[PDB]
Structure 1
Amino acid sequence: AAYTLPQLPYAYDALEPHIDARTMEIHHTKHHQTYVDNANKALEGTEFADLPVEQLIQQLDRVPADKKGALRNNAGGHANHSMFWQIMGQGQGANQPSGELLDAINSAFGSFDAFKQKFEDAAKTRFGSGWAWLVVKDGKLDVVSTANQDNPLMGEAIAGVSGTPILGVDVWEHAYYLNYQNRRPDYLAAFWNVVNWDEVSKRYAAAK
């Protein structure tokens, strides 16, 4: 079918203690796997099966109406997670961006420290399941969030927000409950340790 589960760029325990191996394993091999399987089933009937996922989710307006929900959720699931594994890494940096990106950040947010707050807040104040994102939007950076597996690539009409994600954090409870339980903020603070800013800079460039 269209989609398969990407292999991770690192081992299930590469991100310890920030994220636990068990969680990485379940998250990847079950949660992501299902988004993939279920998207594949949706794409069954359709003209859309050979599209790149990140293209597919920009065309939910074009797909069969009675598939739209299923694809939004599961194609969304797949796109969101495929990104997430790639913007994390072992042994990064204290870790921060530099270059064109650090400059972008400074202009849009004031500083990296300021950006980190604005990001953590979008993430904290996201109620129920969702994601928080750093997007490029008209060449300028902004921070935003989405419900469930919604992505800014799906446009304002569908996701409530818009822009191109270059960084995202899963704040579905499955992403952090085993290690941090209710302590979402503890999870968010640990996150910064494992961001791969090389990859995020990589995408700043593209998205420009």
Structure 2
Amino acid sequence: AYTLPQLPYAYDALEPHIDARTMEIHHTKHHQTYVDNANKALETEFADLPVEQLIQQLDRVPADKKGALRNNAGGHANHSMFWQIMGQANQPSGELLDAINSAFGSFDAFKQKFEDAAKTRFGSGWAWLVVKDGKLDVVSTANQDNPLMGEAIAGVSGTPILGVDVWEHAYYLNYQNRRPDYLAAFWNVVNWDEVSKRYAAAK
């Protein structure tokens, strides 16, 4: 059903912002296990949907496969997006920048807001820039929850166009407890061409 997608770049392509050993473990170990356990939970009538569509249909799948698919289909969708919105000062332009200035006042203030949501995510989770009713918004989720899941499951909603992984596995080898330093580094590896593309597709 699902497979591990290939990275668009080498494991060391994001140095020194994210370390190569982390990129390799994160991808070949953590994401792989999300795929494995998602596939095992789908082996069911929902195994033909792409992961992005499945996680919109969780309140629908059996009551007892729901936790495993949420966590694991969630983890697959999230990490799959995550590799694609990174790439080797760095900022958006065009319509996405205009919408950022409209929703948050400025690129610099959007960053602050995105960082703050990432920092106050207590425990494991993600921070997201989403499109909701045509407008940009910053939110976060717990664990492998995704805003595509809806308000009831995820506690928030919208279509993610960018996300940052703040599970500790995402930054502990390079930054230990220093999440904020990880978050500042993350800005240097965002691929805003890809994010601009996702914004066009979702507005």
1:1-208 matches, cutoff 5 A: 2-44=1-43, 46-88=44-86, 94-208=89-203
How many percent of aligned residue pairs carry the same amino acid? 100
Distance 2:189 2:147 in 1: 23
Q: With the length of structure 1 as denominator, give the TM-score of the two structures.
A: 0.97
Structure 1 runs of 4+ with >2 Å offset: none
What is the CA distance between 1:185 and its match in structure 2? 0.1
Q: With the length of structure 2 as denominator, give the TM-score of the two structures.
A: 0.99
* Superposed CA RMSD: 0.7
What is the CA distance between 1:49 and its match in structure 2? 0.2
* Cα-to-partner distance string for 1:94-152 (whole Å, 9 max, x where unaligned): 11000010000000000000000000000000000000000000000000000000000
Distance 1:100 1:110 in 2: 14
What is the CA distance between 1:21 and its match in structure 2? 0.2
Distance 1:76 1:191 in 2: 21
* Cα-to-partner distance string for 1:177-205 (whole Å, 9 max, x where unaligned): 00000000000000000000000000000
Where structure 2 has 5 or more consecutive residues not aligned to the other structure, the ranges are none
Distance 2:50 2:129 in 1: 21
What is the CA distance between 1:173 and its match in structure 2? 0.1
Distance 1:156 1:122 in 2: 17
Between the two proteins, the alignment pairs up a number of residues equal to 203
SS at match of 2:25: helix
Where structure 1 has 5 or more consecutive residues not aligned to the other structure, the ranges are none
